Design a protein around this ligand. Structure first.
Ligand SMILES: Nc1ncnc2c1ncn2[C@@H]1O[C@H](COP(=O)(O)OP(=O)(O)CP(=O)(O)O)[C@@H](O)[C@H]1O
Ligand SMILES: O=C(C[C@H](NCCCO)C(=O)O)Nc1ccc2ccccc2c1
Length: 206
């Protein structure tokens, strides 16, 4: 009895100039995913093995399989279209920002056997304004409805234990019922996404 209804973006055109930031956002978001998984004990693997914690997507964003790469780009585009659908304006302010933009140097033990070492953008200094933090909460919750909707449209349903064969997932629940740990992790991701706009010189203002 779950009806995820994301913010309607069906009438939003993504201006051609925002396609770079769109690409930037997806890449940096992916790096965070890899760092988080490595920190959860995951390591590279040609094929996914939960018992061993091998993941084929622990590579650079480019080397990602097309099905997995395109998903990250579509979600990235929907994030920007969701901002636009919410009345926000996205315009480039500080062009030199991308110049003094440095990645995070993670310990050497973070490099996988596959040679991939995650290097997300160090955006710690980017302090978000109280209004921007509200936007993050919206994007976070709405990100969950977007994921859920797609998963439901592809034959997925709730289950107590995730089952790749049965297309069942315990997180297919309304945002309110979701575990706070996951909800917080998602907000953190969206928070970095909003920071990626600042760190790249763009201004996010309604
Ligand atoms: N919560 C998330 N936030 C951002 N990107 C994510 C994400 N979960 C997955 N991705 C992107 O999807 C790609 C592959 O998705 P995948 O389904 O393998 O994630 P996953 O293995 O963590 C599912 P699970 O959370 O059930 O373990 C990842 O490399 C990353 O680019
Ligand atoms: O589906 C994705 C991949 C996508 N990565 C590209 C970055 C674009 O900015 C994105 O996070 O937007 N993440 C995602 C989002 C919400 C979720 C809610 C519940 C369970 C899993 C979830 C997974």
């Amino acid at each position: 009895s779950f009806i995820p209804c994301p913010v309607d973006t069906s009438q939003v055109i993504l201006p051609p100039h925002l396609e770079k930031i769109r690409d930037r956002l997806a890449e940096n978001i992916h790096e965070l995913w890899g760092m988080n998984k490595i920190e959860l004990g995951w390591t590279f693997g040609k094929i996914r093995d939960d018992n061993k914690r091998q993941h084929p997507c622990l590579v650079e964003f480019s080397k990602l399989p097309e099905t997995e790469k395109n998903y990250n780009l579509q979600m990235s585009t929907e994030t920007l279209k969701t901002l636009l659908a919410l009345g926000c304006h996205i315009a480039h302010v500080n062009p030199a920002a991308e110049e003094d933009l440095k990645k995070v140097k993670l310990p050497k033990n973070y490099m996988m056997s596959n040679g991939y070492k995650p290097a997300p953008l160090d955006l710690s200094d980017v302090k978000l304004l109280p209004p921007q933090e509200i936007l993050v909460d919206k994007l976070a919750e709405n990100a969950h409805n977007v994921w859920a909707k797609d998963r439901i449209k592809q034959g997925w349903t709730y289950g107590i234990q995730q089952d790749l064969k049965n297309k069942r997932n315990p997180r297919l629940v309304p945002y309110a019922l979701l575990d706070e740990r996951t909800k917080k992790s998602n907000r953190d991701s969206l928070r970095e996404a909003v920071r990626t706009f600042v760190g790249y010189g763009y201004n996010i203002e309604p």
